[model samples]
Target: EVQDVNDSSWKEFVLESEVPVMVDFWAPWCGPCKLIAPVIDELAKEYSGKIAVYKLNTDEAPGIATQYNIRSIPTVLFFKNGERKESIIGAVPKSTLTDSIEKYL
Candidate 1:
């Protein structure tokens, strides 16, 4: 399942995690964010044991959004070993998302 996280739990979940972490940074009002929500969900289930999927609400946690320099909505950040590996902006295809994840996995 995709984990809903914020600044408080980010360090514990994404940073401390040994597996690759994929965080979808989005807001409720973002049209493209909503459009790719389903793809993220399916990826969470499919890559359950291989990676970690999370959703961070920029509206709720502006600090984290700002910390990551999230200038746009639907920016997905990929991390491993407490460092960012890649990032994908805008609503992209499932293959794009999966391709990014697979590299870190």
Candidate 2:
């Protein structure tokens, strides 16, 4: 399952995590985020021990959004070893996400 992240807990769950982290920056009104939810969940399980999957609501977490400069909804940030290394924007295919994940893994 993809856990929720925020400006507060992101440090412990994401940047601080030993595993690679995938964060989907999305909002309640975003349709593309809806389409990608299932894929995120699947990846969470498929990559259970290797990656930490999270979703940060752009509406609820403005600090994180601003820090990441998230101008688009469904912008997925990939992090490894406590720093962000990759970013994918928009409602792209699962292959894109998986491909990025593979890089970190």
Clashing pairs in 2: none
Hey, what RMSD does candidate 2 come out at? 0.9
TM-score of predicted model 2?
0.95
lDDT against the true structure, per candidate, is 0.90, 0.88
In terms of lDDT, the poorest run of 10 residues in model 1 is 64-73
The reply for model 2, stretches above 4 Å from the true place, is: none
Q: C-alpha displacement of 37 in model 1, angstroms?
A: 0.2
lDDT tens readout by residue for model 2, 50-70: 889999998999998888778
